[PDB]
């Protein structure tokens, strides 16, 4: 029972989900460039920074985001940075998005200084989330949800964030009943990943440490969003 109030909300999101765009010339460098542990990393870093901007343009265009406190706005962007990125890269591999270059993106990730300890689960996650046969709506809606998660660290006004997430979560459950009546547990499967994503946030802190000790410059934007001295 998709109400018009919600039919408009989702449409705003899905248009934004195609509106803030990653340039082709940049992502072409996943295919174009040489395949070495040095180059693979340089490329992956380039992709990330460009994506961090795309996520900030997207997050800005989320309904009721700009009305939030300027101080909290950072803490959310900061907290959901990796998770949103993990969610978008999962969509690359799962739905095989042409401009993402899944197979070659996978070659670079698998040879960029990352430990087997963090590669195995990272790709186990990609496989399992793939098997959910997720739609562009379900991808776009989770993103909005992960960004606006009230239980991030260093937040003050979590009730105002709760007011922004609830609206999305309601709309998502509706879509899990509409397009997935066969299985009523589908809304729970989507929420299950929100928890899976969190575990990778911990993994990511250790991943960044490994690169640092092996002399791997990131970027002032990433170093800000993740905190890198």
């Amino acid at each position: 029972e998709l109400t018009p109030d919600q039919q408009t909300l989702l449409h705003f999101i899905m248009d934004s989900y195609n509106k803030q765009r990653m340039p082709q010339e940049i992502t072409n460098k996943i295919l174009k460039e040489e395949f070495s542990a040095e180059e693979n990393f340089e490329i992956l870093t380039e992709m990330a920074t460009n994506h961090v901007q795309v996520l900030v343009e997207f997050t800005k265009k989320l309904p009721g985001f700009q009305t939030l406190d300027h101080e909290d706005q950072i803490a959310l962007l900061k907290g959901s940075a990796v998770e949103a990125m993990f969610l978008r890269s999962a969509e690359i591999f799962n739905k095989k998005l042409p401009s993402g270059h899944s197979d070659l993106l996978e070659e670079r990730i698998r040879n960029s200084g990352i430990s087997d300890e963090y590669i195995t689960p990272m790709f186990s996650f990609y496989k399992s989330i793939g098997e959910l046969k997720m739609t562009q709506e379900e991808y776009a809606l989770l993103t909005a949800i992960v960004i606006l998660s009230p239980d991030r660290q260093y937040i003050k006004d979590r009730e105002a964030v709760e007011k922004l997430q609830e609206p999305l979560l309601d709309v998502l459950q509706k879509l899990c009943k509409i397009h997935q009546p066969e299985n009523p547990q589908h809304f729970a499967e989507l929420l299950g990943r929100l928890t899976e994503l969190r575990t990778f946030n911990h993994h990511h802190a250790e991943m960044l440490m490994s690169w640092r000790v092996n002399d791997h410059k990131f970027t002032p934007l990433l170093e800000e969003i993740w905190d890198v001295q």
Binding site: V56, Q73, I74, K78, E224
Partner: peptide, 11 residues
């Protein structure tokens, strides 16, 4: 602190 994010929102 955190200039670039603040800047990205205001821009």
């Amino acid at each position: 602190d955190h200039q670039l994010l603040r800047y990205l929102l205001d821009k």
